[PDB]
Design a protein around this motif. Structure first.
Motif, PDB file in Angstrom:
ATOM      1  N   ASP A  50      17.757   6.114  52.584  1.00 17.98           N
ATOM      2  CA  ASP A  50      18.608   7.026  51.836  1.00 17.98           C
ATOM      3  C   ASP A  50      18.392   8.448  52.332  1.00 17.98           C
ATOM      4  N   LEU A  51      19.489   9.117  52.690  1.00 18.87           N
ATOM      5  CA  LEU A  51      19.379  10.461  53.246  1.00 18.87           C
ATOM      6  C   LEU A  51      18.853  11.441  52.202  1.00 18.87           C
ATOM      7  N   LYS A  52      19.139  11.183  50.921  1.00 19.70           N
ATOM      8  CA  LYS A  52      18.559  11.989  49.851  1.00 19.70           C
ATOM      9  C   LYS A  52      17.038  11.906  49.854  1.00 19.70           C
ATOM     10  N   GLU A  53      16.492  10.701  50.026  1.00 18.25           N
ATOM     11  CA  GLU A  53      15.047  10.520  49.993  1.00 18.25           C
ATOM     12  C   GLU A  53      14.382  10.768  51.340  1.00 18.25           C
ATOM     13  N   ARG A  54      15.151  11.054  52.390  1.00 22.52           N
ATOM     14  CA  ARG A  54      14.576  11.281  53.714  1.00 22.52           C
ATOM     15  C   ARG A  54      15.473  12.249  54.475  1.00 22.52           C
ATOM     16  N   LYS A  55      15.005  13.480  54.647  1.00 18.10           N
ATOM     17  CA  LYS A  55      15.716  14.425  55.494  1.00 18.10           C
ATOM     18  C   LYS A  55      15.617  13.984  56.953  1.00 18.10           C
ATOM     19  N   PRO A  56      16.651  14.223  57.758  1.00 20.01           N
ATOM     20  CA  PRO A  56      16.617  13.755  59.146  1.00 20.01           C
ATOM     21  C   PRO A  56      15.610  14.537  59.976  1.00 20.01           C
ATOM     22  N   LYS A 163      23.545  20.214  48.370  1.00 20.71           N
ATOM     23  CA  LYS A 163      22.759  20.340  47.149  1.00 20.71           C
ATOM     24  C   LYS A 163      21.806  21.515  47.275  1.00 20.71           C
ATOM     25  N   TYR A 164      20.816  21.585  46.393  1.00 17.12           N
ATOM     26  CA  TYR A 164      19.870  22.687  46.435  1.00 17.12           C
ATOM     27  C   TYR A 164      19.314  22.816  47.836  1.00 17.12           C
ATOM     28  N   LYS A 165      19.892  23.710  48.630  1.00 17.08           N
ATOM     29  CA  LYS A 165      19.455  23.858  50.008  1.00 17.08           C
ATOM     30  C   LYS A 165      19.420  22.483  50.642  1.00 17.08           C
ATOM     31  N   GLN A 166      20.397  21.646  50.308  1.00 20.52           N
ATOM     32  CA  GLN A 166      20.410  20.280  50.814  1.00 20.52           C
ATOM     33  C   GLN A 166      21.788  19.863  51.300  1.00 20.52           C
TER      34      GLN A 166
END
Length: 178
Positions: A50-56, A163-166
């Motif tokens: 999940d890209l939310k749970e793991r930044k690239p 999202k928040y800086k996301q």
DNA sequence: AGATATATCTACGTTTAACAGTGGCCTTATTAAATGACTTCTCCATGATCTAC
């Protein structure tokens, strides 16, 4: 020379650092100095993660085969136009095709372009530096490129979730699969 | 005893015809998962520097 100049040229045996080191002529050393400008860089997203749970953090390096200086210069300057959200891809082939997405198509000229994709990825969570994990050759002809443009047209683009800086990017797996 | 021609009675008629389901329905409701997890460690490359011969 060292690995920072030539990617992949690490000394396998550190105890023999003085002797077993790659050697090159000065002009080729200058070329190895100036390699970074040509190659573009893309970010890889694991579909399972999940890209939310793991930044690239995986970095794909696209290195194109050179047929002419002017053609490569024009191609690189054209590829400069693309948006960062395009650069975030879900497969090595996707990044390779993106590198050749902006190439002009001529029906009289038999189009054929080749490039290398070099995958750099931390071996573990606490890895200090990235390691070369995959190299794959892409040879793109006319039919493959027009089919890829057709897929890009019909299939939806990435969703730039912010999202928040996301600023997450939602890549369509199907496009990559195709 | 061997080889050969003969004689043996019923039998017949053994269903003709017309039909081989006509009707109507061929599921009505509702629910189309509820949760939580989406690897875990280490194995670094390279150069400056310390030190022993």
């Amino acid at each position: 020379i060292t690995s920072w100049l030539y990617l992949g040229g690490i000394v396998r045996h550190a105890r023999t650092q003085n002797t077993t080191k790659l050697e090159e002529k000065p002009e080729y050393a200058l070329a190895l100095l100036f390699v970074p400008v040509v190659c573009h860089y893309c970010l890889l997203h694991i579909p399972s993660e999940d890209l939310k749970e793991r930044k690239p953090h995986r970095y794909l390096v696209v290195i194109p085969e050179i047929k002419d200086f002017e053609d490569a210069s024009q191609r690189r300057w054209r590829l400069q136009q693309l948006e960062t959200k395009q650069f975030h891809v879900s497969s090595l082939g996707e990044a390779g095709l993106l590198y050749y997405s902006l190439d002009d198509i001529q029906p009289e000229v038999a189009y054929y372009q080749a490039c290398q994709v070099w995958l750099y990825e931390k071996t573990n969570k606490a890895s200090r530096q990235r390691t070369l994990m995959s190299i794959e050759e892409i040879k793109i002809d006319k039919n493959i490129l027009i089919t890829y443009q057709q897929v890009q047209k019909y299939f939806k683009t990435n969703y730039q979730i912010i999202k928040y800086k996301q600023i997450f990017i939602k890549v369509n797996p199907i496009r990559s699969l195709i």
